[PDB]
Amino acid sequence: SAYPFFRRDMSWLSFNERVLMEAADRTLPVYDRIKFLSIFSSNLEEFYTVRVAYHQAVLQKHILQAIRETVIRQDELYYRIFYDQILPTLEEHGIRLRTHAPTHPDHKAYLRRFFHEEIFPLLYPMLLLPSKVRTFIRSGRVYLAVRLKEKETDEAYSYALLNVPTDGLPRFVELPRLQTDTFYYYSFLEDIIKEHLDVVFPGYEVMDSYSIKVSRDADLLLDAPTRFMYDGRMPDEVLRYICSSCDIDPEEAIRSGNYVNLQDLAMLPNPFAPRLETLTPEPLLSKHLEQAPSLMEGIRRKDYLIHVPYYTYDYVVRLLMEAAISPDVSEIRLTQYRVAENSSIISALEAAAQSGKKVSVFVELKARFNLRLSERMRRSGIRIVYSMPGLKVHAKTALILYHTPAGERPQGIALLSTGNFNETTARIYSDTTLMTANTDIVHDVYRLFRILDGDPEPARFSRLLVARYNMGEAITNLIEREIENVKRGKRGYMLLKMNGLQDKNVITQLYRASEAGVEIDLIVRGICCLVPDMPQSRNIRVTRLVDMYLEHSRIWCFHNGGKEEVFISSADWMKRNLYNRIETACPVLDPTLRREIIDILEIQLRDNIKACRIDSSLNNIYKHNSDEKPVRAQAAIYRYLKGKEETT
Amino acid sequence: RDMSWLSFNERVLMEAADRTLPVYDRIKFLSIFSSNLEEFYTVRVAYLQAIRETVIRQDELYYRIFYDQILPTLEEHGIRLRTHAPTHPDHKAYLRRFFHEEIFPLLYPMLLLPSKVRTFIRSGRVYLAVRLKEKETDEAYSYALLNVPTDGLPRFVELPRLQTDTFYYYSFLEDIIKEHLDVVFPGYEVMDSYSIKVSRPTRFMYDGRMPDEVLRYIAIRSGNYVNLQDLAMLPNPFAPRLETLTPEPLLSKHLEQAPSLMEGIRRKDYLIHVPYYTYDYVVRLLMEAAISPDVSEIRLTQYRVAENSSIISALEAAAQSGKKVSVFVELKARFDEENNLRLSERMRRSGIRIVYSMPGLKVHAKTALILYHTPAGERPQGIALLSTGNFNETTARIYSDTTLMTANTDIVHDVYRLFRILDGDPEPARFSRLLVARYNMGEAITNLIEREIENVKRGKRGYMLLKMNGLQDKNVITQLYRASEAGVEIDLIVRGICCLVPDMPQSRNIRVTRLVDMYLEHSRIWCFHNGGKEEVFISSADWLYNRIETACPVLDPTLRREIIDILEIQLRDNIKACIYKHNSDEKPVRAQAAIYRYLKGKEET
């Protein structure tokens, strides 16, 4: 009906604004902020190469103008933070990231040597004669466009392109130091190059150079560029001089600040070891699990919930290793985003397959995405099955099966999760993992993998929710039940946390639930297309929580009068999630476990330090409140969980 | 000396010429010749007329093998390495797409303007000097330089194939650039291009078809292809059907049929010789250690931390099982990439302790140690792994190395102690059997030499057998001279750079063999005759005061027999290297194939 919806990209840009804000948070240790600057840059790179590109491919066959307008604004904010706060704060703590060329003799002597012995051999000085010689400018790299005037006083300017060899040198170059010195010194690689251009072009007067960067859909030449970003001091004559070979309208050209590709800030060294950066605490264990005779025995006796970064990642692989050398185990089956890197998990699985046990890995990746690693695994006896086009398996489940009679119920352990088991990222992910021996779940997971492995099985699950099967109905039923309850004069409440909410249908149901008097708390960090503070969303509160850990859990709580039901999911509610992929959602059956999740989510909804509420103009508004005691959810959750573990 | 080892490189080229050898074997020898003539020209010529005459006719020998024999032979076995652009449309289409999508974005076309703009030429890299006319009218020439981006792409490009096709098709990377020059220079009639290659600017191998004026626009003129040592990289479509460099990896069938590897080692010492055997035992043993409840800790030396390997995944698994896992890496890169940082961070997150070599004492000793749990002030009991090579095999050229796997209580305690010395722990620095560089090693070697000299003075035979990569040190060359005059017989098996001259008053007793074979002989072994009660050493280096090195005695008699057997195969007469009587009626073989036949035989006993 007549329902409002944010555009998804505007909503996305709102998210990256909040990332930029972490950088502006002066209460945070500098390197925390620097990390977020880098993240912001890498996110906007991804957005450009898939999302802006998409809209550019459509406009061949306003959104684009809106993006550009917003990005130009965010860019200005970025440089204000960088020059007015970051660089100054670094100096307050003895770090000098030089933005101009050193005057100090020793530093000069050093860099001149460095340029000569280390940089220069990695250069490729390219004169640009546009119609005469063709040249490529690779994406994700930084290049210097140099303007040259020769011997003759003639106005005619020459132009040259050179590389900043960050494929062979660091972006940031440390300058030698004495303990008596006030600072540690750093220089941009491209700055050093700028300061020595005269040796590269001896027969010219080097007029100026400007940093450029191009993002493109892929690095290729056409057979007979989503972004072209450059230092704003650059005259258009030289722009149209590289456009003289690129056919690039002033639409993709965005003039920006003096340093580009600043996602490399993630590479800026902190010479004060653990200082200048929030120390992440030591990951907790479960005492209960630890004091069982073996891990598999523990899960056989009780369900466990593991909340990671707070708890270790170690339980998945430890369990896998137990299972490897156990006589009782017939098979192990799990999902994996890719098989490309070596991992503990792969190793535990290889051991198991070599121990004769049936080992299957269902991998959600593509046609044209490793080869040696897969063959090593197959040789070990592991089986690897891919999602052939249509449904890609986004589900995050593992399965350990015991030897059982014949027509008996499968017995074993199911592991279900909001993210991947393999920790392989520099950013730390907050995620939630259920470990259960429950015979209904274990059977459902059992059945799921047979279905994914193409075997005949009835499309029917006891407790599990699978996408393109029972999940759509279940989500509708659950929401509807809250609507009904309000009409019976009972409380109607929902607590919903995910990375993204974008699906028009589910959003419309939510609006109808609000209209019906159902109260809704949404905790959504990324894209949200539901628009808050509206008549149709009058009973909805929208919280975006962004902090050091990536809030990646997907969790659903339906009040149901007071017989609360909690689900853990692999899916956000996008269009592609509820229809294209195979996903999972799982009921948390154990009451104390369900209670914990709600406790945690309540901690999140109580956050007054990082949490932001969204308004109808897509603004990130901090939920700060001096009157109440300060609570930041990522600190508090750790204290809560550590608390309970001392109560063993 | 130099005339003799230029005639050593003659003997390699001789093998390549050998028309009864399998094509890819011949191709690998040509490849060895090209890498050897190179090394010469950095360590010998840079350090002149007498060189040129004999080299330039070898260069003529080489190219004759290559063009007249190697190329058609491949064709005859259904391998088509083209020297020209394809006429076949499918191929023509492919390379054109390949050029645009893969090669072009990796290109840096630079017009050469010699005094206006300065530019560097990287050594070891192949470039294309390109000669341009902007129009056929001009008569004069523009010039340009082009990279051949073999750092991002292979030197030989395979063209797509149908099972029905007669051949496998390959093209040189630079030739594809040659054919597509006009996309790079649309404004010119692209007159020519020539392969160039520099050494350092001491040398300048280049395409002989190149004029000197363009040479002056920036010197040993050769054929149409430079850096032909790349011919090793050229793949063999037919598994191991046309080579000998990859026979079936051997298993230790005894160890294979023990109830576990850890059980096996616990009961007997084992030797593992690589290419010959599987590389898997170390990884598989490490995994057994990772799942085992008995294992208390795992220590290991590493060169760098760079590759995320099977071994890393294992140690991670061990650390996550709660075991102490420390890793001793000797070099940290200066211009640190994030992939190093990421891998190391993941390992740190997993429980693994990265400990970098504390100054001076870089560990070069490539060892591992698996420790069990033991009662009180008990002796450390476990497994120790000591090797001649690096634990992480990420090689292009194939190295042969030897690994001891022992649970011997003396060595295990010795390796234990060594790690604690590397872990900066104050320790009673006294090793029972092991010999450690800035500790007992120099004294011990000296005695070992002085016991043979002693034995000569006692009327008994004095004998040493040493296998080495090379021997530079003056003090020890003279130490070997000291033993030589004092009546001690000496065998030197070496490969690379060595300056000890034979055939003199101080070297009548020093014979020096240099093997002519495919794998890089990396083992470093010391054999002391000791009046017939023989002593053998596995060693991490060759002759002692800079880093920390290890020499390990081979205590087990049968393993000592084994190594001596191997070494002696490398010393026999029917094997290719360089009063008595025999005839010219036995077919010479290669040491490595003989060694393989030997180790295979041993296993099926």
Beta strands in A426-554 (DSSP E): 429-436, 465-466, 493-498, 519-524, 540-544, 550-551
Helices (H), A453-503: 471-487
Q: Which of B64, B82, B240 is nearest to B167 (CA)?
A: B82
Residue B113 near residue A203, CB atoms below 8 Å: yes
Q: What is the DSSP letter of A532?
A: P
A513 touches chain B (CB under 8 A): no
**Which residues from B are below 8 Å from A376, CB to CB?**
310
- Give B548 to chain A, closest Cα distance, Å: 29
**Which residues from B are below 8 Å from A267, CB to CB?**
338
Which are the contacts of A462, defined by CB distance < 8 A and separation ≥ 6? A440, A441, A443, A444
**Which residues from B are below 8 Å from A315, CB to CB?**
none
A168 touches chain B (CB under 8 A): yes
Catalytic entry in B180, B273, B364, B413: B364
Between the CA of residue B179 and those of A139, B100, B457, what are the distances in Å?
A: 26, 12, 73
**Which residues from B are below 8 Å from A189, CB to CB?**
none
Closest-CA residue of A relative to B339 is A426
Closest-CA residue of A relative to B293 is A322
Q: Which of B95, B122, B90, B286 is nearest to B199 (CA)?
A: B122
Residue B224 near residue B209, CB atoms below 8 Å: yes
Is B273 marked within a binding site? no
Closest-CA residue of B relative to A133 is B185
DSSP strand pairing (B462-467 vs B525-528): antiparallel
Catalytic site includes residue B364: yes
The count of other CB atoms within 10 Å of the CB of residue B201 is 9
Residue B371 near residue B416, CB atoms below 8 Å: yes
Chain centroid to Cα A358, Å, comes to 33
- Give A134 to chain B, closest Cα distance, Å: 5
**Which residues from B are below 8 Å from A312, CB to CB?**
320
**Segment 272-311 of chain A within 8 Å of chain B by CB:** none
Where do the domains of chain A lie? Answer: 1-278, 283-464, 467-646
Among all residues of A, which ones are annotated catalytic? Answer: 394
Residue A598 near residue A495, CB atoms below 8 Å: yes
d(CA A334, CA A348): 12
d(CA A303, CA A285): 15
Which are the contacts of B99, defined by CB distance < 8 A and separation ≥ 6? B176, B177, B179, B180, B183
A200 touches chain B (CB under 8 A): yes
Q: Which of B210, B96, B233 is nearest to B151 (CA)?
A: B233
DSSP-derived secondary structure for B164-221: TSS-EEEEEHHHHHHHHHHHH-TTSEEEEEEEEEEE---EEEEETT--HHHHTT---E
Between the CA of residue B200 and those of B122, B220, B463, what are the distances in Å?
A: 9, 14, 41
- Identify the sign of the CA torsion B200, B202, B207, B212: positive
Mutation pick from B130, B339, B349 vs chain A, by most beta carbons of A within 10 Å, is B349
Is B254 marked within a binding site? no
* In the block, residue with structure tokens 């995320």: B308
Q: What is the DSSP letter of A241?
A: H
Structure tokens at A273: 């070891």
Q: Which residue pairs, CB below 8 angstroms and at least 24 apart, start in B205-214?
A: B206/B129, B210/B129, B211/B131, B214/B129, B214/B131, B214/B141, B214/B143
A204 touches chain B (CB under 8 A): yes
Largest CA distance in chain A: 94
**Segment 439-498 of chain B within 8 Å of chain A by CB:** none
Named by the residue before each, gaps in chain B exceeding 2.5 A from C to N are 47, 200, 218, 543, 578
Method for structure elucidation: X-ray
Beta strands in B291-413 (DSSP E): 295-302, 324-329, 353-356, 366-372, 382-387, 399-400, 402-406
Question: Strand, helix or coil at B497?
Answer: coil
DSSP strand pairing (A205-215 vs B462-467): unpaired
Element at A108 (helix H, strand E): helix A105-114
Note whether A203 contacts B113, CB cutoff 8 Å: yes
d(CA B423, CA B415): 12
Which are the contacts of B505, defined by CB distance < 8 A and separation ≥ 6? none
Question: Strand, helix or coil at B63?
Answer: helix
Helices (H) and strands (E) in chain A, counts: 20, 26
DSSP strand pairing (B203-207 vs B189-199): antiparallel
Which are the contacts of B258, defined by CB distance < 8 A and separation ≥ 6? B264, B267
Torsions phi, psi of A175, nearest 5? -105, 140
d(CA B495, CA B555): 27
DSSP strand pairing (B520-521 vs B525-528): unpaired
Residue B516 near residue B490, CB atoms below 8 Å: no
Helices (H) and strands (E) in chain B, counts: 17, 25
Partnered with residue B298 across adjacent β-strands are B325, B370
Q: Which fold has domain B78-232?
A: polyphosphate kinase like (3.30.1840)
Nearest CB to B313; choose among A126, A127, A343: A343
Is B334 marked within a binding site? yes
d(CA A472, CA A50): 28
- Give B125 to chain A, closest Cα distance, Å: 12
Note whether A126 contacts B110, CB cutoff 8 Å: yes
d(CA A128, CA A237): 13
B530 touches chain A (CB under 8 A): no
A555 CB-side CA count, 13 A: 31
Is B583 marked within a binding site? no
- Give A634 to chain B, closest Cα distance, Å: 19
Domain B1-77+234-246 sits in CATH at 1.20.58.310
Q: Which residues of B509-532 are buried (b: 16+ CB within 10 A; e: fewer)?
A: bbebbbbbbbbbbbbbbbbbbeee
* In the block, residue with structure tokens 């103009």: A617
CATH architecture of A283-464: 2-Layer Sandwich (3.30)
Residue B89 near residue B40, CB atoms below 8 Å: no
Residue B221 near residue B194, CB atoms below 8 Å: no
Beta strands in B20-65 (DSSP E): none
d(CA B299, CA B433): 19
Q: What is the DSSP letter of A122?
A: G
d(CA A219, CA B106): 10
Q: Do domains B247-430+520-523 and B431-519+524-605 have the same CATH topology?
A: yes
Note whether A127 contacts B147, CB cutoff 8 Å: no
Structure tokens at B254: 């005894």
d(CA A114, CA A117): 5
d(CA A335, CA A582): 11
- Give A169 to chain B, closest Cα distance, Å: 6
A323 touches chain B (CB under 8 A): no
Residue B552 near residue B437, CB atoms below 8 Å: no
Note whether A318 contacts B321, CB cutoff 8 Å: yes
Structure tokens at A65: 């103008």
- Alpha carbon dihedral A29, A31, A33, A35, in 10-degree steps, equals -150
Q: Which CATH superfamily is domain B247-430+520-523 in?
A: Endonuclease Chain A (3.30.870.10)
Question: Strand, helix or coil at A461?
Answer: coil
Q: What is the DSSP letter of A281?
A: P
Closest-CA residue of B relative to A196 is B118
Q: How many CB pairs under 8 A join A and B?
A: 135
Torsions phi, psi of A247, nearest 5? 55, 40
A144 touches chain B (CB under 8 A): no
B201 touches chain A (CB under 8 A): no
The count of other CB atoms within 10 Å of the CB of residue A363 is 20
Q: Which of B434, B450, B431, B411 is nearest to B537 (CA)?
A: B434
- Vertex B593 angle, CA B589 and B594, to 5°: 70
Radius of gyration of chain A (CA): 28
**Segment 398-437 of chain B within 8 Å of chain A by CB:** none
DSSP-derived secondary structure for B511-531: EEE----SSEE---EEEE-GG
Q: Which CATH superfamily is domain B431-519+524-605 in?
A: Endonuclease Chain A (3.30.870.10)
Q: Which fold has domain A467-646?
A: Endonuclease; Chain A (3.30.870)
Q: Which residue pairs, CB below 8 angstroms and at least 24 apart, start in A176-181?
A: A176/A106, A176/A107, A176/A110
Which are the contacts of B43, defined by CB distance < 8 A and separation ≥ 6? B497
Torsions phi, psi of A30, nearest 5? -50, -45
Which are the contacts of A199, defined by CB distance < 8 A and separation ≥ 6? A115, A116, A120, B118
Is B308 marked within a binding site? no
Structure tokens at B509: 């007793």
